[PDB]
A = this chain, B = another copy of it.
Amino acid sequence: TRAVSLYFSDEQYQKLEKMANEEEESVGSYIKRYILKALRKIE
């Protein structure tokens, strides 16, 4: 497996949590999902 370690703050994490609560809580997976959703436009 590959290893993606980041360093957010409260605003960034809670804005991710606001989307994750619509998914019924998932924040760590939501962070990955959003990158993977962007990757479909990047390549």
Contacts and interface: CB of A to CB of B under 8 A. Distances in A.
A23 B3 CA distance: 21
Interface in A3-37: 3-10, 12-13, 15-16, 18-19, 28, 31-32, 34-36
Contacts of A4: 5-8, 13, 28, 31
Number of copies of this chain in the oligomer? 2
A38 B15 CA distance: 11
With most chain B CB atoms within 10 A of its CB, the pick from A5, A32, A34, A35 is A35
A32 B6 contact: yes
Contact of A28 (B6, B19, B42, B43): B6
Contacts of A19: 42
